[PDB]
Amino acid sequence: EHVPNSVRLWKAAVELEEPEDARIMLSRAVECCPTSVELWLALARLETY
């Protein structure tokens, strides 16, 4: 809720969140930190059809 640029908090939150909410949080983190290639890769891991 303090909007941290750290990916570790986002990574910890995503791994225990619902997959749809997980990808939404990953998109929010990407908006906060575009350089976070891990979040983009995780979102691409759930890119669907």
């Binding site: 809720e1 909410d21 939404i24 929010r28 906060c32």
Partner: protein, 146 residues
Amino acid sequence: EEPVTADVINPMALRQREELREKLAAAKEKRLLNQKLGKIPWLDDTAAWIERSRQLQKEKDLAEKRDLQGLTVEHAIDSFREGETMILTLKDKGVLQEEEDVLVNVNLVDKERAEKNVELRKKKAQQKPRSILSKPHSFRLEQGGT
């Protein structure tokens, strides 16, 4: 004739008493501090939290647009000669030794030591000679210098 009341000094029972006192003090501190420490929807859903986070991100984006009085000097006032200045440093004392800090010049102390050694090599209100053993030329600074 009759000895007066004397408490038996037990060196290692006193240690037990000290340990018990320390434990009681620690427990009291814990009890006191827990009072100062024990005073302290969106928690169950994630989509609402992400909506709040996006709203706060939008809000953040919108908001983006000299005085040494009292220090003793362990030297006589007459020891210091007019016309020149000279440096004082703290005298060495143990950290646990609770005593007032005194200001000292190494050269002046060397001079005084030499004077004392010269005096002792040539000297060969009650009971003065041994009063030095049981028991000093210092002045107190006020508003800087004196």
